[PDB]
Design a binder for this molecule. Sequence first.
Ligand code: FAD
Ligand code: FSA
Length: 431
Amino acid sequence: PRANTKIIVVGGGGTMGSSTALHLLRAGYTPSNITVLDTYPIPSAQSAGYDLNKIFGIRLRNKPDLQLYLEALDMWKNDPLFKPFFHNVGQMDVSSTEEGIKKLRMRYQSLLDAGIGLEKTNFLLESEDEILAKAPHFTREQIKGWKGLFCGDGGWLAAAKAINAIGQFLKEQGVKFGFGEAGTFKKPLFADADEKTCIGVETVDGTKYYADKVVLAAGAWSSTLVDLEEQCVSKAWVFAHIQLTPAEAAAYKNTPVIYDGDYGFFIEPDENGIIKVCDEFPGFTHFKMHQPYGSPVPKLISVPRSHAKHPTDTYPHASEVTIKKAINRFLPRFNDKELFNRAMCWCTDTADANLLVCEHPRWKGFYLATGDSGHSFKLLPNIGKHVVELLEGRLESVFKDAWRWRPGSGDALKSRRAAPAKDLADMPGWR
Ligand SMILES: *Cc1cc2c(cc1C)nc1c(=O)[nH]c(=O)nc-1n2C[C@H](O)[C@H](O)[C@H](O)COP(=O)(O)OP(=O)(O)OC[C@H]1O[C@@H](n2cnc3c(N)ncnc32)[C@H](O)[C@@H]1O
Ligand SMILES: O=C(O)CSC[C@@]1(O)OC[C@@H](O)[C@@H](O)[C@@H]1O
């Protein structure tokens, strides 16, 4: 029974883990029976979700994407917990290249092909005037030859604030926590030597926690903690910030998120005048000698270099270049603004960019909830609902089949991106 079942959520201070703990409580699990184990207190300072903001938008790449997006949208708009953090300013993808404009048009046509009426809130913008109408901060000269795809249901999400909001509730309810070494997963605990039955976890300080079920929602670290058999390859993306005065920020108030696949994106200034800028590239790995559990020997694994643990890192010189190109493309009036709070943010890619959400094939009672593939902050409100369905043997096949255990299913180093990721050992300047 739910009220009598003990769950441990490893990575419970991050995106998928906090969502899961939330939905355990909403399903009627007893709060004191839920233990969140995260290296950092929620919201985890090293979580990919520990960010001023993130984009919410529709992206149909795999079978469950449409239902997941609609689910999330409903809750970002209507869930009392999450709705303060969704800013429905819309999103506009732009391009001025022949191939880029082709991609926009095809993406639009894919929305239409869903047959549910997405054309009502998503529009191709074929003229300069139409683009300026949605994004008045542009100049007419700047956008010569641009085409746009405007997604009206999109916007941005106050990410760290939303995870904090879950955390405050978990703590009010009396969820148990472990942080630091007493919150850092070392290995699963098993009833027998055959490791067919997981009964808990041990953390790096030696603390043992017993439970009926364990959820590994450790994001970019999951692949380092247990042997995922190269199903997940962890990668770093980059961002920088720029500071605008209130008068500079005024032109951007409630302006849509702007994205171009050849450059990256920026989000409107937050309440303190801060604009976050990202480039667009296939990410950086960080291979280092490492030892995951369930692996007989140390493998080469891409392991996050955590900014929270080493705030003196930034990002490579090549990233400074591409983030400045993005600023020149979108925000040329701010070309002289100083970049700051430069950082790397870690995700873990599967081969096909589907989640990896399933019971471990051998370790019964141990569940994976990872493979975020760099596009899952938007699922904060709803993904925990399906993790709980999975725990309970009620997960529908559209999700179950997409999220299944699948070693050897393709190359996660390239994933659905333009190229295999380069490694930080080959990129100077971040250290
Ligand atoms: C990097 C990034 C990602 C991103 C984005 C921009 C950047 C730069 N923009 C996005 C956007 O606009 N829209 C969107 O939907 N997603 C976007 N993303 C992706 C998003 O950040 C990630 O997909 C998502 O947040 C990942 O969720 P997940 O839960 O998988 O990962 P996490 O939040 O990092 O949580 C992992 C937690 O695990 C803890 N941890 C790590 N090691 C341990 C051990 N050993 N024991 C216990 N806990 C552990 C971490 O502390 C973390 O809290
Ligand atoms: O999933 C989305 O709607 C946008 S994710 C934004 C982003 O920075 O997330 C991290 C990486 O996946 C990047 O490729 C990507 O541009």
